Amino acid sequence: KFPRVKNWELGSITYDTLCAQSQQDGPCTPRRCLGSLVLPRPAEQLLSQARDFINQYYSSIKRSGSQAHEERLQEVEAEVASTGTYHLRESELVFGAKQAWRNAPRCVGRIQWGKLQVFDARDCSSAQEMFTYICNHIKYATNRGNLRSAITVFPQRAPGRGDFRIWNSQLVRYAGYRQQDGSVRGDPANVEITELCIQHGWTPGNGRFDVLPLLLQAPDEAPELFVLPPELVLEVPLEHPTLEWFAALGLRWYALPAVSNMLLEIGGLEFSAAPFSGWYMSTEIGTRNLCDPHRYNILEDVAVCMDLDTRTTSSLWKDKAAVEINLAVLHSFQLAKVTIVDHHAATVSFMKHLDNEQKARGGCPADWAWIVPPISGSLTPVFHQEMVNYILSPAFRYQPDPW
Amino acid sequence: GPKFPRVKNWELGSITYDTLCAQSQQDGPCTPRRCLGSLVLPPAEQLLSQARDFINQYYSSIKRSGSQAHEERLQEVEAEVASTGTYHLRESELVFGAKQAWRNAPRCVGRIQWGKLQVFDARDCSSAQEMFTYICNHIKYATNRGNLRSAITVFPQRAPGRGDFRIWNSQLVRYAGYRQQDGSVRGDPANVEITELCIQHGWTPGNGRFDVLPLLLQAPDEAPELFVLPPELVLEVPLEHPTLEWFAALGLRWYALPAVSNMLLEIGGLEFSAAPFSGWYMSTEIGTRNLCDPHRYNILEDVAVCMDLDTRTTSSLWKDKAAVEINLAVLHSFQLAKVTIVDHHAATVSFMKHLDNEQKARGGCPADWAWIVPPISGSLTPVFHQEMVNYILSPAFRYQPDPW
Ligand code: HEM
Ligand code: HEM
Ligand SMILES: Cc1cc(N)nc(CCc2cccc([C@H](N)Cc3cc(C)cc(N)n3)c2)c1
Ligand SMILES: Cc1cc(N)nc(CCc2cccc([C@H](N)Cc3cc(C)cc(N)n3)c2)c1
Numbered sequence: 115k116f117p118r119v120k121n122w123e124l125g126s127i128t129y130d131t132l133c134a135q136s137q138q139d140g141p142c143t144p145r146r147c148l149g150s151l152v153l154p155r156p157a158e159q160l161l162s163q164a165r166d167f168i169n170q171y172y173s174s175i176k177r178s179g180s181q182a183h184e185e186r187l188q189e190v191e192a193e194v195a196s197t198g199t200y201h202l203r204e205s206e207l208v209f210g211a212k213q214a215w216r217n218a219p220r221c222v223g224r225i226q227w228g229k230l231q232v233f234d235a236r237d238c239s240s241a242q243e244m245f246t247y248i249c250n251h252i253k254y255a256t257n258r259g260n261l262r263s264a265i266t267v268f269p270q271r272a273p274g275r276g277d278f279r280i281w282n283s284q285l286v287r288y289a290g291y292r293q294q295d296g297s298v299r300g301d302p303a304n305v306e307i308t309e310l311c312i313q314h315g316w317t318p319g320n321g322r323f324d325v326l327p328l329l330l331q332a333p334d335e336a337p338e339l340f341v342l343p344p345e346l347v348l349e350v351p352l353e354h355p356t357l358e359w360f361a362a363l364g365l366r367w368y369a370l371p372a373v374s375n376m377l378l379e380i381g382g383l384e385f386s387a388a389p390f391s392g393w394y395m396s397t398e399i400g401t402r403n404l405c406d407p408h409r410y411n412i413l414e415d416v417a418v419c420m421d422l423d424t425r426t427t428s429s430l431w432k433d434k435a436a437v438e439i440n441l442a443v444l445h446s447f448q449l450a451k452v453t454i455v456d457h458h459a460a461t462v463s464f465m466k467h468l469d470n471e472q473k474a475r476g477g478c479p480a481d482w483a484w485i486v487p488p489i490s491g492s493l494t495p496v497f498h499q500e501m502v503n504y505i506l507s508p509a510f511r512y513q514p515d516p517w
Numbered sequence: 518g519p520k521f522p523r524v525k526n527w528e529l530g531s532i533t534y535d536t537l538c539a540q541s542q543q544d545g546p547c548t549p550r551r552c553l554g555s556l557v558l559p560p561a562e563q564l565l566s567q568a569r570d571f572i573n574q575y576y577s578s579i580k581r582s583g584s585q586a587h588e589e590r591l592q593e594v595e596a597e598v599a600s601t602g603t604y605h606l607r608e609s610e611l612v613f614g615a616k617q618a619w620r621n622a623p624r625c626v627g628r629i630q631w632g633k634l635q636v637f638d639a640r641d642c643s644s645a646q647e648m649f650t651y652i653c654n655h656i657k658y659a660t661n662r663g664n665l666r667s668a669i670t671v672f673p674q675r676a677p678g679r680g681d682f683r684i685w686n687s688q689l690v691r692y693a694g695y696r697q698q699d700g701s702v703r704g705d706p707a708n709v710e711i712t713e714l715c716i717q718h719g720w721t722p723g724n725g726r727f728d729v730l731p732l733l734l735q736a737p738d739e740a741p742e743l744f745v746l747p748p749e750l751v752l753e754v755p756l757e758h759p760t761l762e763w764f765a766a767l768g769l770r771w772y773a774l775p776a777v778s779n780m781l782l783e784i785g786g787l788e789f790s791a792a793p794f795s796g797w798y799m800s801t802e803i804g805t806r807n808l809c810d811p812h813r814y815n816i817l818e819d820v821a822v823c824m825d826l827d828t829r830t831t832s833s834l835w836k837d838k839a840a841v842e843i844n845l846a847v848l849h850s851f852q853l854a855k856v857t858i859v860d861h862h863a864a865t866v867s868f869m870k871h872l873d874n875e876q877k878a879r880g881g882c883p884a885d886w887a888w889i890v891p892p893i894s895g896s897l898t899p900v901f902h903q904e905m906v907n908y909i910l911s912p913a914f915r916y917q918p919d920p921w
């Protein structure tokens with residue numbers, strides 16, 4: 115059945131028919147929904163994902179059935195028959211990476227899907243080479259605060275060997291140092307990776323915002339450590355437009371959100387190291403990273419600096435402080451001339467995206483629980499929009515940590 | 518290892534498996550191909566099957582499964598269904614099933630309170646006038662001068678051939694929505710349709726933003742009849758802000774008693790078409806959705822202007838600031854007036870505790886994440902960080918089509 119999809123603010127109705135093209139089961143069953151879970155609980159098969167993808171591609175450039183389409187399908191058939199695998203042409207890779215982003219149900223930034231700079235790093239044979247690539251990516255994507263979306267794609271997985279991998283989950287991450295006294299100094303989300311870096315030879319700092327080194331690993335080798343040159347790592351000091359004490363808290367965050375541990379799947383080929391970046395939405399930093407209890411957890415501190423009654427929930431001290439902190443992030447990013455989008459502008463743009471996708475493809479897979487921001491949900495138009503979630507390919511997938 | 522879904526809390530890093538979901542006898546809207554969790558709204562041997570399960574549920578809740586009273590009550594129920602097509606609940610069965618429908622509601626965050634329901638049995642009711650009296654009594658009991666008490670009143674079950682008992686209003690207290698000669702709405706846009714119906718059926722309308730509506734009550738095979746609630750029974754709270762002295766001058770207000778009137782309570786296959794139930798409010802329902810939704814009272818811009826915020830740009834967070842202050846006004850005004858209310862922090866914290874109780878007691882809790890997480894400050898509340906499994910158990914409250 116093609117599901118009915120209603121927006122309850124405007125009363126408007128669409129039908130998702132794009133979900134028919136999913137070939138990959140999600141976690142839900144008619145007996146129970148698991149859409150709030152973060153993680154999911156032959157060569158004939160490669161060949162049919164390859165065919166489907168090459169069809170996607172020739173259709174995308176309007177040359178379906180053409181000589182070139184039919185010859186390219188033979189190339190792939192011929193290559194899989196003989197080798198159990200194949201290779202994509204740069205133009206295909208580029209179309210695949212764009213379509214992976216477009217298909218990502220948890221991304222609120224997808225109106226930007228077509229504007230993606232793809233660096234082909236498949237000609238890479240060492241951790242050293244990977245580092246050089248990763249550095250040019252940072253330089254490009256950062257662009258002196260005028261951030262630009264980008265992916266760099268490292269060599270695909272092959273049956274006969276270990277994967278290329280970036281052990282870090284993002285390219286820029288702040289150390290979290292566990293204390294004898296149980297507590298964490300720095301970002302508690304990164305304690306395990308910090309410890310791995312120390313163990314593979316890094317000399318640690320002891321600050322709340324020590325930028326971490328990369329652990330890059332080429333196939334079947336121990337990973338290697340590379341420190342990022344600080345001048346490549348753009349950071350923004352947090353201040354508040356009206357509250358002067360705020361700056362004194364010493365808070366900061368990096369400009370560049372670059373995911374580096376997700377697998378990119380194209381035409382049934384898999385790219386284990388394929389880091390990608392855009393720009394931040396303020397709530398990611400101001401609400402989750404700084405206010406989550408199991409992150410920097412700065413909410414009391416701020417609320418105490420604001421002289422708020424902390425002794426009861428019903429004063430809404432938590433809510434008031436979170437708002438100011440999100441404000442600080444937006445103000446400081448603007449002042450520093452680094453790209454940021456607030457959650458209202460972002461969600462407005464995502465509604466426009468659903469609408470473009472409805473005309474173009476007949477649907478947009480989307481994960482309501484990740485699209486609605488972590489503060490002021492019902493204040494944003496997406497709260498009120500029903501959404502259908504399902505897995506199209508090309509796709510970004512979660513993968514297990516390599517250790 | 519267990520082939521039950523694993524449920525994780527990402528704040529604390531703890532894990533459970535829901536085994537309760539195995540007792541679901543009714544499919545929801547999702548499939549392996551696509552998840553539809555975010556959508557608001559997607560007899561004979563059959564009844565006998567539902568009734569046996571419910572009776573079995575009753576006998577376990579009192580620890581007599583397999584007992585002689587148990588096998589006899591099963592026998593009574595097949596006998597009654599055999600000779601009439603339906604059967605009837607014992608009083609203590611109705612009490613149990615009503616509580617179990619509340620406990621089973623995936624969308625209710627207030628379920629730590631589920632054991633405390635007062636169940637008014639109104640299965641003797643025989644006219645619309647009598648529904649009115651029962652409803653008035655419900656409101657008086659539940660409101661209790663601001664010290665609110667959970668309650669439900671249960672009217673006669675659906676019967677074959679004979680028509681239903683039905684309350685046409687969706688809630689017992691609702692503000693009028695008056696459609697204007699331009700196209701705007703005065704009052705609550707949510708209630709334009711029931712307003713128009715009240716007027717068609719003979720109600721003389723007001724012209725305020727907060728006109729309390731009358732009730733359209735429908736006894737079997739009869740046209741609905743109209744009943745004005747006496748104003749003294751409808752407790753309202755005028756809204757003011759603790760420090761922003763101008764907020765009181767906006768004349769905003771809300772009623773104390775949240776009381777759903779159009780849901781069907783299903784127990785053991787039996788269908789109670791009129792069974793209104795009431796609790797108390799979580800502040801975000803009033804201060805965020807009812808007052809600030811674009812398609813409700815929509816006051817966010819007005820408040821932001823009073824607060825002097827820059828409304829010409831999203832990145833001032835003018836909406837976020839105004840919403841916070843409205844929510845605080847709601848909490849503050851309810852507290853000052855000694856009317857029970859719970860803020861979104863206390864509610865959600867209570868619901869985590871309920872989850873833990875229910876893990877021990879039943880091996881899971883059906884929960885709808887999009888509804889349980891509040892509409893402001895989501896990730897500041899612990900439920901944001903808690904995975905939830907959603908499924909249908911019975912007894913249940915189910916949505917039903919409007920009677921008209
Ligand atoms: C250009 C600006 C972009 C914005 C504002 C944006 C925004 C977001 C946000 C807010 C999330 C949720 C993140 C969280 O809660 O941790 C997200 C998730 C994601 N976005 Fe983006 N995005 C952007 C660009 C991109 C690009 C360039 C890619 C890939 C090429 C991408 C792929 C994803 C994916 C795969 C996720 C899911 C991550 C996960 O599952 O952990 N987005 N996006
Ligand atoms: C005692 C205090 C209670 C609180 C604070 C409370 C809180 C809530 C909240 C916040 C919602 C979401 C409503 C919305 O978004 O419009 C809700 C839904 C609901 N609650 Fe409660 N609840 C309470 C008592 C009750 C009682 C006594 C019943 C039934 C006996 C009940 C059954 C429900 C049901 C069925 C829904 C879903 C309604 C729908 O789908 O439209 N709750 N609850
Ligand atoms: C390109 C881009 C733009 C933007 N504005 N934001 C981002 C944030 C990305 C991000 C960062 C840290 C952690 C996670 C995710 N929380 C990491 C994660 C963990 C697990 C266990 C599962 C899963 N699916 N995901 C995702 C990326
Ligand atoms: C007892 C109780 C306590 C409390 N704190 N809050 C309430 C909220 C009541 C309520 C009111 C208006 C609209 C809806 C729901 N939005 C009404 C609705 C509409 C549709 C189409 C589907 C659906 N499932 N629901 C639900 C009840």
Ligand SMILES: C[C@H](O)[C@H](O)[C@H]1CNc2nc(N)[nH]c(=O)c2N1
Nearest residue numbers: 150151152483484901902903904
């Ligand atoms: C359990 C729940 O799914 C989990 O907390 C999700 C909720 N929604 C989210 N949404 C975004 N955008 N990012 C997140 O990390 C999460 N966490």
Ligand SMILES: C[C@H](O)[C@H](O)[C@H]1CNc2nc(N)[nH]c(=O)c2N1
Nearest residue numbers: 497498499500555556557887888
């Ligand atoms: C589209 C989406 O399902 C819808 O707007 C839901 C989201 N969560 C909600 N949650 C509650 N508690 N109440 C609601 O009315 C809604 N609306």
Ligand SMILES: [Zn+2]
Nearest residue numbers: 142147547552
């Ligand atoms: Zn689902």
